[PDB]
């Protein structure tokens, strides 16, 4: 957990409905998004951060949490949008004599910033007496090994955790769900869906001066008034179709 692995996912179509076939977990824990809607969205990037904790600490893998893990080992941002997947791995990560291949950081001078990894093995100095790298009074070793055994209770058994963080920026989308894209229809009232941005309106050719890095435009009420087509990089103006009041 103190040296949690991180993998970057980009330039691919992500089908989140096969994640049930890879790990024997019971449900997602998705913050800011719903697990069933993941296949209908495009994200600029995905990050899969994997590690092992024990049962008690699975509750700490969540935005706004505090503890040993959330402070010194693995911290999630308060504005987190993603999904946490944790499953019991007592059959794999537990030995009869004890599994001491998994460790956690117990002491640290200050709390971790979100998504910060600290792999320093320096001796922690609780007091003022210098340690000079040697354990002693008020000189602790910050890393402590979990002792995982098959006879431990469900709260003390190992749990494998994978955190998926969805970077949804203004950049062009790179990770999308399986979704076939139809032909572009202009000058007609249609239900459009650009990279998961859904709406209803009339799409017209535009002469707005989008800079090469921009991808969409907003309005006074933060309503998307222009878009960039993901395939043919042109600028489309979105207009409400047609409506009015009718008096008798």
């Amino acid at each position: 957990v103190y040296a949690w692995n991180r993998k970057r996912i980009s330039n691919c179509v992500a089908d989140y409905s096969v994640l049930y076939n890879f790990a024997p977990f019971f449900a997602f824990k998705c913050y800011g998004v719903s697990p069933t809607k993941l296949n209908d969205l495009c994200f600029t990037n995905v990050y899969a951060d994997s590690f092992v904790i024990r049962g008690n600490e699975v509750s700490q893998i969540a935005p706004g949490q505090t503890g040993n893990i959330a402070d010194y080992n693995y911290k999630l941002p308060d504005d987190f949008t993603g999904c946490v997947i944790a499953w019991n791995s007592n059959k794999l990560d537990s030995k009869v004599g004890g599994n001491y291949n998994y460790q956690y950081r117990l002491f640290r001078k200050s709390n971790l910033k979100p998504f910060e990894r600290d792999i320093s093995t320096e001796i922690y100095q609780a007091g003022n007496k210098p340690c000079n790298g040697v354990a002693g009074f008020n000189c602790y070793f910050p890393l402590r090994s979990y002792g995982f055994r098959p006879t431990y209770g469900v709260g003390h058994q190992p749990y494998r955790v994978v955190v998926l963080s969805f970077e949804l920026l203004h950049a062009p989308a790179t990770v999308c769900g399986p979704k076939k894209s139809t032909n572009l229809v202009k000058n007609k009232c249609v239900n459009f869906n650009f990279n998961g941005l859904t709406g209803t309106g009339v799409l017209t050719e535009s002469n707005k001066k989008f800079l090469p890095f921009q991808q969409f435009g907003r309005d006074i009420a933060d309503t998307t008034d222009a878009v960039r087509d993901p395939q043919t990089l042109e600028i489309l103006d979105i207009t409400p179709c047609s409506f009015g009041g009718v008096s008798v």
Partner: antibody
Amino acid sequence: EVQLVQSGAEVKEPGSSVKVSCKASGGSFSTSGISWVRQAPGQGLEWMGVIIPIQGTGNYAQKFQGRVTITADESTTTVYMELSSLRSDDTALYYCARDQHIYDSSGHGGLWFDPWGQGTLVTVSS
Amino acid sequence: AIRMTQSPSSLSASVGDRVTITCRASQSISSYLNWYQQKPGKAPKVLIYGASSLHSGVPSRFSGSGSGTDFTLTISRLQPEDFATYYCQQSHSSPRSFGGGTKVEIK
């Protein structure tokens, strides 16, 4: 508990170096300090240095710095101590021991060396 | 830079007697003192760690106390197998300085 097994005896000459192995049976490796304590014939014990295998380096007392090198082989679960520039005062029994360091919440309880090797008699022949 | 001083260096007692050994530190080490028992030809064994705790398997006759700079190891009833050399070690800070060692002999 954990069992420590060292190598055999050594016969050397002043100006040479000696490498002593200490294989741990196992159970907390890469987090347990493998301390080395030497004992001169008819004299008291003396602490040379300690190594935590995950640190990579080795810490030593302010009497052996500069001529003691301790390294750990994680794959073989063996700790190696290399004492260079041997002299007459380097003939002793060389033990390897494992620290525990149980602390409750304030400083109660300290370190102790429960497992000791059988001892590696190193003789610096003249 | 912490030194440990023992007293006495060699005491001769009988079986069933009470033995008191003192271990003094130059400066306060809290409760990071240990007591080791070494028999000739063998590696030392732990009897007291933390100045007040008994290791697993240690007979109840051994008892340690004290804190700061004054410490004491006490054997309530001496035994024929309790004649050995006793070393007190401080775990406060590097270096771990062993005491001069007290040798308990048969009267």
